[PDB]
Design a protein around this nucleic acid. Structure first.
Ligand SMILES: *P(=O)(O)OC[C@H]1O[C@@H](n2cnc3c(N)ncnc32)[C@H](O)[C@@H]1O
Ligand SMILES: [Mn+2]
Ligand SMILES: [Mn+2]
Ligand SMILES: [Mn+2]
Ligand SMILES: [Mn+2]
Lengths: 243, 245, 252, 439
DNA sequence: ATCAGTCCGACGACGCATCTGCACTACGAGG
DNA sequence: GTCGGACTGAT
DNA sequence: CCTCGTAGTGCAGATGCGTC
């Protein structure tokens, strides 16, 4: 395999945010894409990432069944050493992966290939009775400030009104989003309610770099869906669970 | 009960200078202005804050309202704003208080009213022997330099200069003489030499960036008082008892 | 008189004293016909530093006889860390107590004077190691910082090669390996190469040396030879020099 | 409300002067007989040395040994070096702080503007201030803790401000425990010496003491014979006895006796009310959070309803079934990072007793029906098992099982008692359970 | 003139936790 | 837990 | 492009706790 991305910042950010619920993942090589899928040890949050055949240019395919794993800590530690908007190249050897930067000079980091195999995808087959869409900056700003108030995040909705509420023993918080003011358009569905965790959804806010827009589907006693729109029809998903 | 104030950067230094000295406080809204007096637990400090009815954007309160709070939690709900955003506080029943942050994506907070026990305190008539009006940016540097090694400062004065120095293992000295950037007023009176703990002076280092002129006053066998002045005639005081001597 | 020197920019003298404090907590100083000159060596004999200030940048100079001032920078390290106004005027004087540092500033109009207890003595003659190096280059500061930081994640050995007019840096072990390049004029300003050789220097010593180079906005001068120590030369903001000496490990 | 803390200090003054357990117990009843109601629970909590029982999940007080020196220096207006040097000689910090409130005083700022007033402190505000100091989380906590503590020290009397320091320490070298407290309360409130056994049983029922005291002083001396274990406040365990291996234990028994295994590692106690999992330790402490992985094993595999069962938790070798020392198990129960080292440290539980399942008391029934009924509620697996219930006949048979027990690890073997007399007592030592171990 | 039950404060060496203060470092307002 | 280390008893 | 300064962020450096 041989790939190249002219932006090594967004990809580092997306790998960093992926590698916060897992401990070991596994890359997959197909005829037209590369995917990352795994489940959390806590058996609560499920996440999968798909990248099309245009985000990384100069894509050459050597074999059609390449499966390469990686230790979660080493890749993040190596990619932490990014200077500026440089260019990264990844080439798949027989039993190792080499990361080389293209900036002022050359770099080269080598990591051994580890053995790991686990694939338990829960089927979705869901039709959520609510739909909304809003900008990524607004969501990042509005979640990065309600984090330090509690743990039970209660999601509430009404007729074209989606309300965020966090309630504690001493005091409670509330946020409001409306189509006229700050919630774009495409607000339809039914009236439901639910409640979810706080730390899980707080850890996913590190996506203010490779994102332009996002969706939000939820119901009652049903897992909530978070979808992120990457450039050139790319997407990544996060599934959480009720309480 | 409707109060509106434009900027919250002013109401962050006051709060972070009040979170380091006490655990509870009370705000008293009147028909003229807003007052705040809160002693310390060890009775070695006193900080008073007053804001007039001119900075408020044409709002008024028809009666009294004793609003209590906790320093940490209130300071935690004033970190939401980043740019020059607005704020307004209002409530109807004498049990709950509503606080709103506006401008950006709106946010509201419902706060319960705690109960705080306070004692009677007289007025202030502490005269001294010195009326130094040194700059504000130099005092912070002088404190952060001298009080990094010692546990007791020394403040001695003279007819021509103000001498700040520490003793013991190291003897460093900083002066504010009339040479270039020192005093701008001084009464002769007498020469005084006192001492103060180096920890109680760090709790008021974020109160500096409200003006560019301080009023340092002290004397022999007298406490330490410093004064600040803002627009609208705001008043901030800080009375500190001396050392055991 | 006996001791009266003046330096324009205190944010260079403080950088010098920090750099010399990176190897020891005590400073030995001598004032003679060569101005300011210090010297220290680590007990393991792996890093050597020599500091020389030429006797022309100083605004004032008035001595009477050779004398030494043996200092111990333990508590003054934080006190002296309050230099501002960029080129704040600093002058040095002697006292029977041992020393007195005076700082003058114009942003706020104050003074900073300290009392330091030290004894007097006699100066010592200039002592510099004798060595010849051929391969050399001149680069910026942050490049060395990047090279030092990127090497702690592989191992503790650092080797430098310049075969066929191409500079290569390799380190680590068989499993985890590092490869870098230093081409002509791509990251560099000036270059002059004669032959090729190896370095086999240490890593912690390199990091410590690089950490003491911040604040000198000048193209650093670097040279080395074949199985010989390493020299790093930097230029001061207002005037001066500071040359280090990185010891090798021979065949280790 | 109208009380003062002077009385407790005065009554504690004459406590390190008597060495007869039959004398101090008589004097101890006076304070309880004279103290007022609605604060009796606080008074009882004060004596033992805790602000509240330690199964409610409340944080520990943060004031330590070296911070008290700083607090005393702040309160008494003395330099830190002076008080440190004085304390370096005399070990007892109480005596160190004793004299410093007679030869020096304080002025402060309240009074320069004009103020002269002083009132005697009350026990209610002392308890409230201690409770407030207990939580004090914040960010800048240290200055909000030491200064908050110094208020009482600056509002104290020379005799009063000597036992408060020990109170912060957490130990009272006076001569009062808990059994003596129970015996004194029985004599004082009850009025009859023989009426202490009912109080002892009532305390054995509930791990707390303030609630027992308040229900004793509300309803009366009666209404104690009909208290049963709710899913909550636990019951104190029993202890064993050690001796040699002569023809003594068997002569005490006579024939075959129930023999079990002496597992090594942390013990446990479970209270599952069909919805939640509560786990306790060898003493009173909520270890549920520190042990979250096995909350499902004890839930789904133990099919039934609300119960109270007792077992033991021991670490296992990750590769296969193999016992490991408690020292190894100590490694994991300290860090918040759970699902990175938890899966490498197996936790296998065993079961050895049952207390309260079928909505009725069982602690007085003979120790065979309980075992027979507990043998029903079990699911065979590799995470929940039962004790090695075996029977020997002579000394020449115990060694055969003892050698196997040693070869399988653990501290050794333990014996039990069979018959009507084998009842599950609470507290004490007794002679029903006997243990034998090696060095 | 003696052997059996009851009760009670010290034993200090330790992993590990939690705040405090100090270097680095990216980024947004004003000339 | 633990070894004292007292204390308190009954013929 | 050149200046703060403001805020995060990583890292050593102390003190207190529960267990036999
Ligand atoms: P060790 O003296 O270190 O620990 C004593 C505790 O272990 C429990 N225990 C030992 N042996 C058994 C058996 N066979 N069954 C149940 N519990 C046992 C005791 O409960 C002691 O508390
Ligand atoms: Mn506890
Ligand atoms: Mn503590
Ligand atoms: Mn303690
Ligand atoms: Mn054991």
């Amino acid at each position: 395999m041989k790939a190249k991305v002219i932006d090594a910042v967004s990809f580092s950010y997306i790998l960093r945010t992926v590698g916060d619920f897992l401990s070991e993942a596994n890359f997959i090589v197909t005829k037209e894409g590369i995917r990352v899928s795994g489940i959390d040890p806590s058996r609560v949050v499920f996440l999968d990432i798909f990248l099309p055949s245009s985000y990384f240019e100069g894509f050459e395919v050597s074999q059609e069944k390449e499966i390469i794993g990686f230790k979660l800590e080493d890749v993040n530690d190596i990619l932490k050493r990014v200077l500026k908007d440089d260019t990264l190249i990844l080439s798949s050897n027989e039993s190792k992966l080499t990361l080389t930067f293209d900036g002022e000079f050359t770099r080269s980091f080598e990591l051994p290939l580890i053995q790991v195999e686990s694939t338990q995808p829960p089927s979705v087959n869901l039709e959520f009775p609510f739909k909304a869409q809003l900008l990524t900056i607004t969501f990042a700003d509005i979640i990065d400030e309600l984090s330090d108030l509690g743990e039970v995040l209660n999601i509430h909705s009404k007729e074209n009104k989606l309300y965020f509420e966090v309630i504690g023993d001493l005091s409670t918080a509330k946020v409001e989003l409306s189509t006229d003011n700050g919630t774009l358009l495409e607000a339809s569905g039914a009236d439901v309610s639910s409640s979810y965790g706080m730390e899980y959804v707080a850890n996913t806010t590190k996506m203010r770099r490779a994102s332009d827009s996002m969706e939000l589907y939820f119901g009652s006693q049903i897992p909530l869906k978070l979808r992120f729109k990457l450039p050139q029809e790319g997407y990544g998903d996060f599934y959480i669970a009720p309480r | 009960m409707k109060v509106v104030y434009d900027d919250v950067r002013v109401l962050k230094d006051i709060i972070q200078a009040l979170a380091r000295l006490v655990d509870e406080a009370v705000l008293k809204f009147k028909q003229d202005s807003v007052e705040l007096v809160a002693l310390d637990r060890a009775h070695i400090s006193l900080i008073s804050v007053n804001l007039p009815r001119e900075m408020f954007k044409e709002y008024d309160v028809n009666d009294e309202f004793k609003f209590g709070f906790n320093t940490q939690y209130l300071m935690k709900i004033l970190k939401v704003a980043k740019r020059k955003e607005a704020i307004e506080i209002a409530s109807e029943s004498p049990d709950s208080v509503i606080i709103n942050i506006i401008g950006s994506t709106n946010r509201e907070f419902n706060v319960r009213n705690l109960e705080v026990s306070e004692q009677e305190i007289p007025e202030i008539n502490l005269q001294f022997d010195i009326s130094a009006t040194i700059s504000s940016d130099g005092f912070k540097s002088a404190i952060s330099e001298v009080s990094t090694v010692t546990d007791n400062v020394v403040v001695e004065g003279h007819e021509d200069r103000i001498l700040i120095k520490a003793e013991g293992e190291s003897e460093v000295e900083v002066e504010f003489s009339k040479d270039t950037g020192g005093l701008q007023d001084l009464e002769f009176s007498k020469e005084s030499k006192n001492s103060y703990s180096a920890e109680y002076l760090d709790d008021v280092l974020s109160l500096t960036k409200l003006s560019d002129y301080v009023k340092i006053s002290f004397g022999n066998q007298k406490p330490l008082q410093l004064f600040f002045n803002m627009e609208g005639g705001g008043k901030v005081t800080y009375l500190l008892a001396p050392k055991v001597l | 008189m006996a001791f009266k020197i003046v330096y324009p920019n205190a944010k260079d003298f403080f950088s010098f004293i920090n750099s010399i404090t990176n190897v020891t907590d005590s400073i030995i100083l001598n004032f003679t016909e060569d101005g300011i000159f210090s010297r220290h060596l680590t007990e393991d004999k792996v890093l050597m530093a020599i500091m020389r200030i030429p006797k022309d940048v100083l605004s004032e100079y008035s001595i009477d006889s050779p004398t030494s001032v043996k200092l111990d920078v333990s508590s003054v390290k934080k006190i002296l860390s309050k230099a501002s106004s960029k080129k704040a005027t600093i002058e040095l004087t002697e006292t029977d107590s041992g020393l007195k540092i005076i700082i003058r500033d114009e942003k706020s109009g104050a003074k900073s004077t300290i009392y330091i207890k030290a004894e007097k003595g006699q100066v010592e003659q200039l002592t510099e190691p004798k060595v010849n190096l051929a391969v050399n280059f001149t680069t910026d500061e942050s490049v060395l910082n990047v090279i030092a930081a990127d090497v702690t994640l592989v191992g503790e050995e650092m080797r430098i090669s310049t075969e066929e007019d191409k500079i290569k840096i390799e380190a680590g072990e068989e499993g985890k390996r590092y490869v870098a390049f230093l081409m002509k004029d791509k990251p560099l300003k000036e270059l002059s190469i004669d032959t090729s050789a190896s370095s086999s220097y240490s890593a912690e010593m390199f990091k410590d040396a690089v950490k003491g180079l911040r604040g000198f906005s000048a193209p650093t001068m670097v040279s080395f030879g074949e199985n010989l120590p390493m020299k790093i030369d930097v230029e001061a903001v207002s005037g001066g020099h500071m040359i280090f000496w990185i010891a090798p490990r021979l065949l280790e | 409300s109208h009380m003062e803390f002077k009385v407790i200090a005065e009554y504690f003054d004459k406590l390190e002067k008597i060495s007869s357990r039959l004398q101090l117990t008589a004097l101890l009843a006076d304070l309880l007989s004279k103290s007022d109601k609605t604060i009796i629970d606080k008074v009882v909590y004060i004596i033992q040395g805790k602000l509240w029982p330690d199964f409610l999940g409340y944080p520990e007080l943060g004031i330590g040994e070296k911070f008290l020196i700083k607090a005393i220096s702040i309160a008494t207006n003395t330099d830190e070096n002076s008080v440190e040097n004085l304390y370096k000689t005399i070990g007892d910090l109480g005596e160190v702080a004793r004299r410093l409130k007679s030869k020096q005083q304080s002025t402060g700022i309240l009074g320069f503007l004009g103020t002269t007033s002083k009132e005697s402190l009350t026990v209610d505000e002392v308890y409230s201030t201690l409770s407030k100091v207990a939580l004090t989380t914040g960010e800048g906590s240290r200055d909000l803790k030491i200064r908050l503590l110094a208020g009482l020290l600056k509002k104290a009397d020379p005799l009063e401000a000597k036992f408060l320091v020990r109170f912060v320490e957490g130990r009272l070298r006076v001569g009062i425990g808990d059994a003596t407290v129970l015996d004194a309360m029985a004599i004082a409130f009850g009025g009859g010496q023989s009426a202490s056994e009912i109080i002892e049983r009532a305390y054995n029922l509930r791990a707390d003491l303030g609630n027992i005291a308040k229900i004793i002083v509300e309803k009366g001396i009666e209404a104690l014979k009909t208290l049963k274990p709710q899913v909550g406040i636990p019951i104190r365990p029993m202890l064993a006895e050690r001796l040699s291996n002569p023809e003594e234990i068997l002569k005490k028994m006579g024939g075959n006796a129930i023999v079990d295994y002496k597992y090594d590692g942390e013990r446990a106690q479970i209270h599952k009310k069909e919805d939640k999992i509560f786990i306790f330790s060898r003493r009173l402490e909520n270890i549920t959070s520190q042990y979250p992985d096995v909350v499902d094993y004890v839930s789904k595999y133990i099919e039934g309803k609300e119960f109270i069962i007792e077992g033991e938790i021991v670490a296992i070798d990750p590769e296969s079934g193999e016992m490991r020392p408690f020292q190894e198990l100590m490694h994991r129960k300290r860090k918040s990072d759970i699902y990175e080292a938890i899966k490498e440290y197996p936790v296998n539980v065993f079961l050895f007793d049952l207390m309260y399942y079928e909505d009725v008391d069982y602690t007085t029934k003979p120790l065979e029906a309980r075992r027979k009924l507990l043998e029903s509620i079990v699911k065979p697996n590799d995470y929940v098992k039962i004790a090695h219930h075996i029977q020997a006949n002579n000394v020449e048979d115990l060694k055969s099982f003892f050698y196997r027990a040693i070869s399988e690890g653990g501290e050794g073997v333990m014996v039990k008692a069979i018959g009507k007399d084998a009842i599950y007592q609470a507290g004490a030592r007794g002679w029903l359970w006997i243990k034998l171990k090696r060095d």
